[PDB]
Amino acid sequence: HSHGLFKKLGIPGPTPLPFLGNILSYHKGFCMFDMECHKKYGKVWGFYDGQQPVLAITDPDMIKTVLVKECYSVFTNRRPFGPVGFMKSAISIAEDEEWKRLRSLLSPTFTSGKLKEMVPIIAQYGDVLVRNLRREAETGKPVTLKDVFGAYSMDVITSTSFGVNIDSLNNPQDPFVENTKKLLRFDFLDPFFLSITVFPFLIPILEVLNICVFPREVTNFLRKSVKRMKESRLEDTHRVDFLQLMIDSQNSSHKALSDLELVAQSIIFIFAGYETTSSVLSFIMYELATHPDVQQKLQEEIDAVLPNKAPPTYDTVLQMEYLDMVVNETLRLFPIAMRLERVCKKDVEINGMFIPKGVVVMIPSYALHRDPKYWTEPEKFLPERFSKKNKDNIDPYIYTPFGSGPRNCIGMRFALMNMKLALIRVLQNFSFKPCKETQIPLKLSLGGLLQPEKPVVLKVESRD
Ligand code: HEM
């Protein structure tokens, strides 16, 4: 038991119970716990996830020192998450140079020039979402944002990973959908993951038993699909899509994306860009619906830059600001990641405090984003916060929805754009208003994922 590392170092935090540590404080969730700790221990506090020392930091200087300055040196890797298998080669799970290699191979794929060429396909499904959303609205019943924005998200990373173009909302059985739909996020407060962190000696046992957190049935299916797709369709001789950009690169520093690595990167891109988007999109619509003044002002801004339901364009989106403000403000209130984690690879000292080796440095994003010491009425949805004549009053190391430094969200530009394209056409064709079932105020889940307690159902009316 390392339970006492923190007070020997003079770092405050909750009293750890043997073996369990401080996991029984996650009964409320990662978010509530972090904020209770932040108020009851000030800037720095240390807790034990089983027997893993976790040190929380809230100093913009120290966050920059961890996320940016000493990234490649000390704070490169994230914490091991469980039996991963071949998916160990996915950028998100990769560690040290092996990561640094992959990052460089993929850095181009997520360039504005590539994104701008992908807009046509993303916008195509903007219409598919609208046409789909139309029906349910006219039908005269409340709409499950979870389902429609889920189908939109799905039709995206799927379609920008080769031309398997699908209306998942109308094809709930397309195997390709059936499999990819299981690529949801991990509730790390689920008995299993909780059991794994108290008993990390089990991860090796599960690995030789060929048990993997990523459902094999899905992993294999794609591992076959990607291979058939990489040959059967495009070695007759291409479409602008992550896969193609990955196949194009393979055949021209460290390079040579292993056929299996390519699959792993593809799988992690839907894992990182499926429920993430579907969740944020729904959160925005709730905030817009609950604040009609914002929804109109946004609907107006769109109609101005795009006269008469004018097709959304790349350059056009960059212009729209109030939209960027609404998106950025919804992210402040709902940082889906909740926490930004880096492992201390060696014994180091940063701006004063000393960090032992093998300690997980945690940036409580949710807590920072809602810290009254940086935010006026933090529980208020005030887009104005992110005005051109205010943003310079926002520390980038406090507002970290996509993280920061060399290991930030590589698909940040894509995710923002992808959400913007939808919101624009969605608001262009419809208006969202509180329903009888609409839960106000919105109650967040006590689990290990930043989701609503009850699914967001709202009334959709087609303005003319
Ligand atoms: C609203 C949408 C999204 C949000 C809020 C989001 C947020 C995040 C955050 C907070 C991280 C961790 C950054 C850190 O540790 O400092 C991350 C990592 C990552 N995200 Fe996203 N993300 C989003 C969408 C996407 C999409 C669409 C993709 C890919 C298509 C993607 C790919 C990744 C990858 C690969 C990483 C790991 C990067 C690395 O290890 O170098 N994300 N994301």
Side-chain angles (χ1 to χ4, degrees), residues 67 78 90-94 99 103 106 110 157 185 242 268-270 272-274 276-277 280 331 334-342 365 400-412 414-416 418-419:
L67 289 189
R78 308 207 176 81
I91 173 154
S92 70
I93 303 149
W99 165 70
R103 195 70 165 173
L106 310 161
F110 302 85
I157 303 301
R185 305 299 297 182
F242 297 134
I268 219 58
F269 294 156
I270 148 173
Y274 183 28
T276 52
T277 314
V280 179
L331 284 172
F334 309 113
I336 54 165
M338 296 163 291
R339 298 165 149 198
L340 273 34
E341 288 179 350
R342 300 281 191 282
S365 291
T400 60
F402 290 96
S404 179
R407 197 141 194 175
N408 67 282
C409 180
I410 197 170
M412 167 164 43
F414 182 97
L416 294 157
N418 177 36
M419 288 189 297

CSV table of all heavy atoms in Angstrom, one decimal, residues 67 78 90-94 99 103 106 110 157 185 242 268-270 272-274 276-277 280 331 334-342 365 400-412 414-416 418-419, ligand 1:
chain,number,residue,atom,x,y,z
A,67,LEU,N,1.1,19.5,-19.7
A,67,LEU,CA,0.4,19.2,-21.0
A,67,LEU,C,1.4,19.6,-22.2
A,67,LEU,O,1.3,18.8,-23.2
A,67,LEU,CB,-0.9,20.0,-21.1
A,67,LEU,CG,-2.0,19.4,-20.2
A,67,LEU,CD1,-3.3,20.2,-20.5
A,67,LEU,CD2,-2.2,17.9,-20.3
A,78,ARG,N,-0.9,8.5,-21.4
A,78,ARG,CA,-2.1,8.4,-20.5
A,78,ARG,C,-2.0,7.1,-19.7
A,78,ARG,O,-1.1,6.3,-20.0
A,78,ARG,CB,-3.4,8.4,-21.4
A,78,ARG,CG,-3.4,9.6,-22.4
A,78,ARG,CD,-4.8,10.0,-22.8
A,78,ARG,NE,-4.9,11.2,-23.6
A,78,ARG,CZ,-4.7,11.2,-25.0
A,78,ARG,NH1,-4.4,10.0,-25.6
A,78,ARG,NH2,-4.8,12.3,-25.6
A,90,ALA,N,-3.2,1.8,-31.3
A,90,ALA,CA,-4.0,3.0,-31.5
A,90,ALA,C,-3.4,4.2,-30.8
A,90,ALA,O,-3.0,4.1,-29.6
A,90,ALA,CB,-5.4,2.8,-31.0
A,91,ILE,N,-3.2,5.4,-31.6
A,91,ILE,CA,-2.6,6.6,-31.1
A,91,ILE,C,-3.0,6.9,-29.7
A,91,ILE,O,-2.1,7.3,-28.9
A,91,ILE,CB,-2.9,7.8,-32.1
A,91,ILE,CG1,-2.4,9.1,-31.5
A,91,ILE,CG2,-4.4,7.9,-32.4
A,91,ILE,CD1,-2.0,10.1,-32.6
A,92,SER,N,-4.3,6.8,-29.3
A,92,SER,CA,-4.8,7.2,-28.0
A,92,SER,C,-4.2,6.4,-26.9
A,92,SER,O,-4.0,6.9,-25.8
A,92,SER,CB,-6.3,7.1,-28.0
A,92,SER,OG,-6.8,5.8,-28.1
A,93,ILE,N,-3.9,5.1,-27.2
A,93,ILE,CA,-3.4,4.1,-26.2
A,93,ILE,C,-1.9,4.0,-26.3
A,93,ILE,O,-1.3,3.6,-25.3
A,93,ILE,CB,-4.2,2.7,-26.4
A,93,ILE,CG1,-5.7,2.9,-26.3
A,93,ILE,CG2,-3.6,1.7,-25.5
A,93,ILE,CD1,-6.5,1.9,-27.2
A,94,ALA,N,-1.3,4.3,-27.5
A,94,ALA,CA,0.1,4.2,-27.8
A,94,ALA,C,0.9,5.1,-26.7
A,94,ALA,O,0.3,6.0,-26.2
A,94,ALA,CB,0.4,4.7,-29.2
A,99,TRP,N,4.0,6.4,-29.9
A,99,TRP,CA,2.9,7.5,-30.1
A,99,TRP,C,3.5,8.6,-31.0
A,99,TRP,O,2.8,8.9,-32.0
A,99,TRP,CB,2.5,8.1,-28.8
A,99,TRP,CG,1.7,9.4,-28.9
A,99,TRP,CD1,0.5,9.5,-29.4
A,99,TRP,CD2,2.2,10.7,-28.6
A,99,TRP,NE1,0.1,10.8,-29.5
A,99,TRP,CE2,1.2,11.6,-29.0
A,99,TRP,CE3,3.4,11.2,-28.1
A,99,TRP,CZ2,1.3,13.0,-28.8
A,99,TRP,CZ3,3.5,12.6,-27.9
A,99,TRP,CH2,2.4,13.4,-28.3
A,103,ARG,N,1.6,9.9,-34.3
A,103,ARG,CA,1.1,11.3,-34.3
A,103,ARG,C,1.5,12.0,-35.7
A,103,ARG,O,0.7,12.6,-36.3
A,103,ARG,CB,1.7,12.1,-33.1
A,103,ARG,CG,1.1,13.4,-32.9
A,103,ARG,CD,-0.3,13.3,-32.3
A,103,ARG,NE,-0.8,14.5,-31.7
A,103,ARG,CZ,-2.1,14.7,-31.2
A,103,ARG,NH1,-3.0,13.7,-31.3
A,103,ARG,NH2,-2.4,15.9,-30.7
A,106,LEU,N,-0.2,10.7,-38.9
A,106,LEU,CA,-1.6,11.0,-39.0
A,106,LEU,C,-1.8,12.5,-39.0
A,106,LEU,O,-2.9,13.0,-39.5
A,106,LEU,CB,-2.3,10.4,-37.7
A,106,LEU,CG,-2.0,8.9,-37.5
A,106,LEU,CD1,-2.4,8.6,-36.0
A,106,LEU,CD2,-2.8,8.1,-38.5
A,110,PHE,N,-5.4,15.1,-40.6
A,110,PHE,CA,-6.2,16.1,-39.8
A,110,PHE,C,-5.6,17.5,-40.1
A,110,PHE,O,-5.3,18.2,-39.1
A,110,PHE,CB,-6.2,15.8,-38.3
A,110,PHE,CG,-6.8,14.4,-38.0
A,110,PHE,CD1,-6.0,13.3,-38.1
A,110,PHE,CD2,-8.1,14.3,-37.7
A,110,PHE,CE1,-6.5,12.0,-37.8
A,110,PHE,CE2,-8.6,13.0,-37.4
A,110,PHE,CZ,-7.8,11.9,-37.5
A,157,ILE,N,-18.1,9.6,-39.4
A,157,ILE,CA,-16.8,8.9,-39.3
A,157,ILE,C,-16.8,7.6,-40.2
A,157,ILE,O,-15.8,7.2,-40.7
A,157,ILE,CB,-16.4,8.5,-37.9
A,157,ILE,CG1,-16.4,9.7,-36.9
A,157,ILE,CG2,-15.1,7.7,-37.8
A,157,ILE,CD1,-15.4,10.7,-37.3
A,185,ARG,N,-18.4,4.7,-25.6
A,185,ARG,CA,-17.3,5.1,-24.7
A,185,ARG,C,-17.4,4.2,-23.5
A,185,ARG,O,-18.4,3.5,-23.3
A,185,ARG,CB,-17.5,6.6,-24.2
A,185,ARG,CG,-17.5,7.6,-25.4
A,185,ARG,CD,-16.3,7.6,-26.2
A,185,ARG,NE,-15.1,8.1,-25.4
A,185,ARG,CZ,-13.9,8.2,-25.9
A,185,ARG,NH1,-13.6,8.0,-27.2
A,185,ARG,NH2,-12.9,8.6,-25.1
A,242,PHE,N,-10.4,9.4,-44.4
A,242,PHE,CA,-9.3,9.0,-43.5
A,242,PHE,C,-8.6,7.8,-44.0
A,242,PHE,O,-7.3,7.8,-44.2
A,242,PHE,CB,-9.8,8.8,-42.0
A,242,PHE,CG,-10.4,10.0,-41.4
A,242,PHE,CD1,-11.6,9.9,-40.7
A,242,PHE,CD2,-9.8,11.3,-41.5
A,242,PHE,CE1,-12.2,11.0,-40.1
A,242,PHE,CE2,-10.4,12.4,-40.9
A,242,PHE,CZ,-11.6,12.2,-40.2
A,268,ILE,N,-10.3,3.6,-33.6
A,268,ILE,CA,-10.2,4.6,-32.4
A,268,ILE,C,-10.8,6.0,-32.9
A,268,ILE,O,-11.3,6.7,-32.0
A,268,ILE,CB,-8.7,4.8,-32.0
A,268,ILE,CG1,-8.6,4.9,-30.5
A,268,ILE,CG2,-8.0,5.9,-32.7
A,268,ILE,CD1,-9.2,3.8,-29.7
A,269,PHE,N,-10.8,6.3,-34.2
A,269,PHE,CA,-11.4,7.5,-34.7
A,269,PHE,C,-12.9,7.5,-34.6
A,269,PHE,O,-13.5,8.5,-34.2
A,269,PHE,CB,-11.0,7.7,-36.2
A,269,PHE,CG,-9.5,8.0,-36.5
A,269,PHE,CD1,-9.0,7.7,-37.7
A,269,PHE,CD2,-8.7,8.6,-35.5
A,269,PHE,CE1,-7.6,7.9,-38.0
A,269,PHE,CE2,-7.3,8.8,-35.8
A,269,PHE,CZ,-6.8,8.5,-37.1
A,270,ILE,N,-13.5,6.3,-34.7
A,270,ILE,CA,-15.0,6.2,-34.5
A,270,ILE,C,-15.2,6.2,-33.0
A,270,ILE,O,-16.2,6.8,-32.5
A,270,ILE,CB,-15.7,5.0,-35.2
A,270,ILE,CG1,-16.9,4.5,-34.4
A,270,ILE,CG2,-14.7,3.9,-35.6
A,270,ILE,CD1,-17.7,3.5,-35.2
A,272,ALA,N,-13.6,7.7,-30.7
A,272,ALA,CA,-13.3,9.1,-30.2
A,272,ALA,C,-14.3,10.1,-30.9
A,272,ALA,O,-14.4,11.2,-30.4
A,272,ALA,CB,-11.9,9.5,-30.5
A,273,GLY,N,-15.0,9.7,-32.0
A,273,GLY,CA,-15.8,10.6,-32.7
A,273,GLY,C,-17.2,10.1,-33.0
A,273,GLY,O,-17.7,10.4,-34.1
A,274,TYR,N,-17.8,9.3,-32.1
A,274,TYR,CA,-19.1,8.8,-32.3
A,274,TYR,C,-20.0,9.3,-31.2
A,274,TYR,O,-20.9,10.2,-31.4
A,274,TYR,CB,-19.1,7.2,-32.3
A,274,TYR,CG,-20.5,6.6,-32.6
A,274,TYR,CD1,-21.5,7.2,-33.3
A,274,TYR,CD2,-20.7,5.3,-32.1
A,274,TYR,CE1,-22.7,6.6,-33.5
A,274,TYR,CE2,-22.0,4.7,-32.3
A,274,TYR,CZ,-22.9,5.3,-33.0
A,274,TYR,OH,-24.1,4.7,-33.2
A,276,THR,N,-19.1,10.9,-28.5
A,276,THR,CA,-18.5,12.3,-28.2
A,276,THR,C,-19.4,13.4,-28.8
A,276,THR,O,-20.0,14.2,-28.1
A,276,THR,CB,-17.1,12.4,-28.6
A,276,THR,OG1,-17.0,12.0,-30.0
A,276,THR,CG2,-16.1,11.6,-27.8
A,277,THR,N,-19.5,13.3,-30.2
A,277,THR,CA,-20.3,14.3,-31.0
A,277,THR,C,-21.8,14.2,-30.7
A,277,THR,O,-22.3,15.3,-30.3
A,277,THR,CB,-20.0,14.0,-32.5
A,277,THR,OG1,-18.6,13.9,-32.7
A,277,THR,CG2,-20.6,15.2,-33.4
A,280,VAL,N,-22.4,15.9,-27.3
A,280,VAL,CA,-22.2,17.4,-27.3
A,280,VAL,C,-23.3,18.1,-28.1
A,280,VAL,O,-23.9,19.1,-27.7
A,280,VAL,CB,-20.8,17.8,-27.9
A,280,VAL,CG1,-20.6,19.3,-28.0
A,280,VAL,CG2,-19.7,17.1,-27.1
A,331,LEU,N,-19.4,23.5,-24.4
A,331,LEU,CA,-18.2,22.6,-24.1
A,331,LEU,C,-17.7,23.0,-22.7
A,331,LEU,O,-17.2,22.0,-22.0
A,331,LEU,CB,-17.1,22.9,-25.2
A,331,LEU,CG,-17.3,22.2,-26.5
A,331,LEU,CD1,-16.3,22.7,-27.5
A,331,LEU,CD2,-17.3,20.7,-26.4
A,334,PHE,N,-20.0,21.3,-20.4
A,334,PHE,CA,-20.0,19.8,-20.6
A,334,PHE,C,-18.7,19.4,-21.3
A,334,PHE,O,-18.7,19.1,-22.5
A,334,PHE,CB,-21.2,19.5,-21.5
A,334,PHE,CG,-22.6,20.0,-21.0
A,334,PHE,CD1,-23.3,20.9,-21.7
A,334,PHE,CD2,-23.1,19.5,-19.7
A,334,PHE,CE1,-24.5,21.4,-21.2
A,334,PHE,CE2,-24.3,20.0,-19.3
A,334,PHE,CZ,-25.0,20.9,-20.0
A,335,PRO,N,-17.6,19.4,-20.6
A,335,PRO,CA,-16.4,18.7,-21.1
A,335,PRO,C,-16.5,17.2,-20.9
A,335,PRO,O,-16.2,16.7,-19.9
A,335,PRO,CB,-15.3,19.3,-20.2
A,335,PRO,CG,-16.0,19.6,-18.8
A,335,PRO,CD,-17.4,19.9,-19.2
A,336,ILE,N,-16.9,16.6,-22.0
A,336,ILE,CA,-17.2,15.1,-22.1
A,336,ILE,C,-16.1,14.3,-21.6
A,336,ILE,O,-16.4,13.2,-20.9
A,336,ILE,CB,-17.6,14.7,-23.5
A,336,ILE,CG1,-16.5,15.0,-24.6
A,336,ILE,CG2,-19.0,15.3,-23.9
A,336,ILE,CD1,-16.7,14.4,-25.9
A,337,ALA,N,-14.8,14.7,-21.8
A,337,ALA,CA,-13.6,14.0,-21.3
A,337,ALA,C,-13.6,14.0,-19.7
A,337,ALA,O,-13.2,13.0,-19.1
A,337,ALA,CB,-12.4,14.6,-21.8
A,338,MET,N,-14.1,15.1,-19.2
A,338,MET,CA,-14.3,15.4,-17.7
A,338,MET,C,-12.9,15.6,-17.1
A,338,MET,O,-12.8,16.6,-16.3
A,338,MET,CB,-14.9,14.2,-17.0
A,338,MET,CG,-16.4,14.0,-17.4
A,338,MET,SD,-16.9,12.3,-16.9
A,338,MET,CE,-15.9,11.3,-18.0
A,339,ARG,N,-11.9,14.8,-17.4
A,339,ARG,CA,-10.5,14.9,-16.9
A,339,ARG,C,-9.5,14.7,-18.0
A,339,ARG,O,-9.8,14.0,-18.9
A,339,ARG,CB,-10.3,13.7,-15.8
A,339,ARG,CG,-11.3,13.8,-14.6
A,339,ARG,CD,-11.3,12.5,-13.9
A,339,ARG,NE,-11.5,12.6,-12.5
A,339,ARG,CZ,-11.2,11.7,-11.5
A,339,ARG,NH1,-10.7,10.5,-11.9
A,339,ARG,NH2,-11.4,12.0,-10.3
A,340,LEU,N,-8.3,15.3,-17.8
A,340,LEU,CA,-7.2,15.2,-18.7
A,340,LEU,C,-6.1,14.6,-17.9
A,340,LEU,O,-5.6,15.2,-17.0
A,340,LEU,CB,-6.7,16.6,-19.2
A,340,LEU,CG,-7.4,17.1,-20.5
A,340,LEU,CD1,-8.9,16.7,-20.6
A,340,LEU,CD2,-7.3,18.6,-20.5
A,341,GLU,N,-5.6,13.4,-18.2
A,341,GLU,CA,-4.6,12.6,-17.4
A,341,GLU,C,-3.3,12.4,-18.2
A,341,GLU,O,-3.4,12.2,-19.4
A,341,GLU,CB,-5.3,11.2,-17.1
A,341,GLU,CG,-6.4,11.3,-16.1
A,341,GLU,CD,-7.1,10.0,-15.8
A,341,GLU,OE1,-6.8,9.0,-16.6
A,341,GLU,OE2,-7.9,9.9,-14.9
A,342,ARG,N,-2.2,12.5,-17.4
A,342,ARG,CA,-0.8,12.2,-17.9
A,342,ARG,C,-0.1,11.4,-16.8
A,342,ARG,O,-0.2,11.9,-15.6
A,342,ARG,CB,-0.1,13.4,-18.3
A,342,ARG,CG,-0.7,14.2,-19.4
A,342,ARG,CD,-0.5,13.7,-20.8
A,342,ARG,NE,-0.9,14.6,-21.9
A,342,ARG,CZ,-2.2,14.8,-22.3
A,342,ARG,NH1,-3.2,14.1,-21.7
A,342,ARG,NH2,-2.4,15.7,-23.2
A,365,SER,N,-10.9,19.1,-15.6
A,365,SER,CA,-11.5,20.0,-16.6
A,365,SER,C,-12.9,20.6,-16.2
A,365,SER,O,-13.0,21.8,-16.1
A,365,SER,CB,-11.6,19.4,-18.0
A,365,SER,OG,-10.3,19.2,-18.5
A,400,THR,N,-10.0,23.6,-21.3
A,400,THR,CA,-9.4,22.5,-22.0
A,400,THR,C,-10.4,21.5,-22.4
A,400,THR,O,-10.4,20.3,-21.8
A,400,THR,CB,-8.3,21.9,-21.2
A,400,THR,OG1,-8.8,21.4,-20.0
A,400,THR,CG2,-7.1,22.9,-20.9
A,401,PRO,N,-11.4,21.8,-23.3
A,401,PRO,CA,-12.4,20.8,-23.7
A,401,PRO,C,-11.8,19.7,-24.6
A,401,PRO,O,-12.3,18.6,-24.5
A,401,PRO,CB,-13.4,21.7,-24.5
A,401,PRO,CG,-12.6,22.8,-25.0
A,401,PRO,CD,-11.6,23.1,-23.9
A,402,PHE,N,-10.9,20.1,-25.5
A,402,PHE,CA,-10.1,19.2,-26.4
A,402,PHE,C,-8.7,18.9,-25.9
A,402,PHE,O,-7.9,18.3,-26.6
A,402,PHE,CB,-10.1,19.8,-27.8
A,402,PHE,CG,-11.4,19.8,-28.5
A,402,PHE,CD1,-12.2,21.0,-28.5
A,402,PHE,CD2,-11.9,18.7,-29.2
A,402,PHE,CE1,-13.4,21.0,-29.2
A,402,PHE,CE2,-13.1,18.8,-29.9
A,402,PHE,CZ,-13.9,19.9,-29.9
A,403,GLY,N,-8.4,19.3,-24.6
A,403,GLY,CA,-7.1,19.3,-24.0
A,403,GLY,C,-6.2,20.4,-24.6
A,403,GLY,O,-6.8,21.4,-25.2
A,404,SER,N,-4.9,20.2,-24.5
A,404,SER,CA,-3.9,21.2,-25.0
A,404,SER,C,-2.5,20.5,-25.0
A,404,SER,O,-2.3,19.4,-24.3
A,404,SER,CB,-3.8,22.5,-24.2
A,404,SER,OG,-2.8,23.3,-24.8
A,405,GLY,N,-1.5,21.0,-25.8
A,405,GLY,CA,-0.2,20.5,-25.9
A,405,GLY,C,-0.1,19.5,-27.1
A,405,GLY,O,-1.0,19.4,-27.9
A,406,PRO,N,1.0,18.8,-27.3
A,406,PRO,CA,1.2,17.8,-28.4
A,406,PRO,C,0.2,16.7,-28.4
A,406,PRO,O,0.0,16.2,-29.5
A,406,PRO,CB,2.6,17.3,-28.1
A,406,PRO,CG,3.3,18.3,-27.3
A,406,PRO,CD,2.2,18.9,-26.4
A,407,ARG,N,-0.4,16.3,-27.3
A,407,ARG,CA,-1.4,15.2,-27.2
A,407,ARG,C,-2.8,15.7,-26.9
A,407,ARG,O,-3.4,15.2,-25.9
A,407,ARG,CB,-0.9,14.2,-26.1
A,407,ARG,CG,-1.5,12.8,-26.2
A,407,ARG,CD,-0.5,11.7,-25.9
A,407,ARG,NE,-1.0,10.4,-26.2
A,407,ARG,CZ,-0.4,9.3,-26.2
A,407,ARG,NH1,0.9,9.2,-25.8
A,407,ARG,NH2,-1.0,8.1,-26.6
A,408,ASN,N,-3.2,16.7,-27.7
A,408,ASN,CA,-4.6,17.2,-27.7
A,408,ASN,C,-5.4,16.4,-28.7
A,408,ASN,O,-4.8,15.5,-29.3
A,408,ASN,CB,-4.7,18.7,-27.9
A,408,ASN,CG,-4.2,19.0,-29.4
A,408,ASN,OD1,-3.0,19.0,-29.7
A,408,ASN,ND2,-5.2,19.3,-30.2
A,409,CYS,N,-6.8,16.6,-28.7
A,409,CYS,CA,-7.7,15.9,-29.7
A,409,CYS,C,-7.2,16.3,-31.1
A,409,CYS,O,-7.4,17.5,-31.5
A,409,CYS,CB,-9.1,16.4,-29.5
A,409,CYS,SG,-10.3,15.6,-30.6
A,410,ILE,N,-6.7,15.3,-31.9
A,410,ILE,CA,-6.2,15.5,-33.3
A,410,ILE,C,-7.4,15.8,-34.2
A,410,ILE,O,-7.1,16.6,-35.2
A,410,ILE,CB,-5.4,14.2,-33.7
A,410,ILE,CG1,-4.6,14.5,-35.0
A,410,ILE,CG2,-6.4,13.1,-34.0
A,410,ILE,CD1,-3.6,13.4,-35.3
A,411,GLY,N,-8.6,15.3,-33.9
A,411,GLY,CA,-9.8,15.6,-34.6
A,411,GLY,C,-10.6,16.7,-34.0
A,411,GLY,O,-11.9,16.6,-34.1
A,412,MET,N,-10.0,17.7,-33.4
A,412,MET,CA,-10.7,18.9,-32.8
A,412,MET,C,-11.3,19.7,-33.9
A,412,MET,O,-12.5,19.9,-33.9
A,412,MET,CB,-9.6,19.8,-32.0
A,412,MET,CG,-10.2,21.1,-31.7
A,412,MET,SD,-9.1,22.0,-30.4
A,412,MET,CE,-7.5,21.6,-31.1
A,414,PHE,N,-12.0,18.9,-37.1
A,414,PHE,CA,-13.1,18.0,-37.6
A,414,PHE,C,-14.3,18.0,-36.8
A,414,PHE,O,-15.4,18.3,-37.3
A,414,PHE,CB,-12.5,16.6,-37.8
A,414,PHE,CG,-13.5,15.7,-38.4
A,414,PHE,CD1,-13.5,15.4,-39.8
A,414,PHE,CD2,-14.5,15.0,-37.7
A,414,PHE,CE1,-14.4,14.5,-40.4
A,414,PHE,CE2,-15.4,14.2,-38.3
A,414,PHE,CZ,-15.3,13.9,-39.6
A,415,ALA,N,-14.2,17.7,-35.5
A,415,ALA,CA,-15.3,17.6,-34.5
A,415,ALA,C,-16.1,18.9,-34.5
A,415,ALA,O,-17.4,18.8,-34.6
A,415,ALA,CB,-14.8,17.2,-33.2
A,416,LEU,N,-15.4,20.0,-34.3
A,416,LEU,CA,-16.0,21.4,-34.3
A,416,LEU,C,-16.8,21.6,-35.6
A,416,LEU,O,-18.1,21.8,-35.5
A,416,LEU,CB,-14.9,22.4,-34.2
A,416,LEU,CG,-14.2,22.4,-32.8
A,416,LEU,CD1,-12.8,23.1,-33.0
A,416,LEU,CD2,-15.0,23.1,-31.7
A,418,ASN,N,-17.7,19.4,-38.0
A,418,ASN,CA,-18.8,18.4,-38.2
A,418,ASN,C,-20.0,18.8,-37.4
A,418,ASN,O,-21.1,18.7,-38.0
A,418,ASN,CB,-18.3,17.0,-37.7
A,418,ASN,CG,-19.4,15.9,-37.8
A,418,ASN,OD1,-20.2,15.9,-38.7
A,418,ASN,ND2,-19.4,15.0,-36.9
A,419,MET,N,-19.9,19.2,-36.2
A,419,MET,CA,-21.0,19.7,-35.3
A,419,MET,C,-21.6,21.0,-35.9
A,419,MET,O,-22.9,21.0,-36.0
A,419,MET,CB,-20.6,20.0,-33.9
A,419,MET,CG,-20.2,18.7,-33.1
A,419,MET,SD,-19.9,19.0,-31.4
A,419,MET,CE,-18.5,20.0,-31.4
B,1,HEM,C1,-16.9,17.1,-29.4
B,1,HEM,C2,-16.0,16.2,-29.9
B,1,HEM,C3,-14.7,15.8,-29.2
B,1,HEM,C4,-14.2,16.2,-28.0
B,1,HEM,C5,-14.8,17.1,-27.0
B,1,HEM,C6,-12.9,15.5,-27.9
B,1,HEM,C7,-12.1,15.7,-26.7
B,1,HEM,C8,-10.9,15.0,-26.6
B,1,HEM,C9,-10.1,15.1,-25.4
B,1,HEM,C10,-10.3,16.0,-24.2
B,1,HEM,C11,-9.0,14.4,-25.7
B,1,HEM,C12,-7.8,14.2,-24.7
B,1,HEM,C13,-6.8,15.4,-24.9
B,1,HEM,C14,-5.8,15.4,-23.8
B,1,HEM,O1,-5.6,14.3,-23.1
B,1,HEM,O2,-5.2,16.4,-23.5
B,1,HEM,C15,-9.1,13.8,-26.9
B,1,HEM,C16,-8.2,12.9,-27.5
B,1,HEM,C17,-8.4,12.4,-28.8
B,1,HEM,N1,-9.4,12.6,-29.6
B,1,HEM,FE1,-10.9,13.7,-29.3
B,1,HEM,N2,-12.7,14.8,-29.0
B,1,HEM,C18,-13.7,15.0,-29.8
B,1,HEM,C19,-13.8,14.4,-31.1
B,1,HEM,C20,-12.9,13.6,-31.7
B,1,HEM,C21,-13.0,13.1,-33.0
B,1,HEM,C22,-14.1,13.4,-34.0
B,1,HEM,C23,-11.8,12.4,-33.3
B,1,HEM,C24,-11.4,11.6,-34.5
B,1,HEM,C25,-12.1,11.6,-35.6
B,1,HEM,C26,-11.1,12.4,-32.1
B,1,HEM,C27,-9.8,11.8,-31.9
B,1,HEM,C28,-9.1,11.9,-30.8
B,1,HEM,C29,-7.8,11.2,-30.6
B,1,HEM,C30,-7.1,10.4,-31.6
B,1,HEM,C31,-7.4,11.5,-29.4
B,1,HEM,C32,-6.1,11.1,-28.8
B,1,HEM,C33,-4.9,11.9,-29.3
B,1,HEM,C34,-3.6,11.5,-28.9
B,1,HEM,O3,-3.4,10.5,-28.1
B,1,HEM,O4,-2.6,12.0,-29.4
B,1,HEM,N3,-11.7,13.2,-31.2
B,1,HEM,N4,-10.3,14.2,-27.5
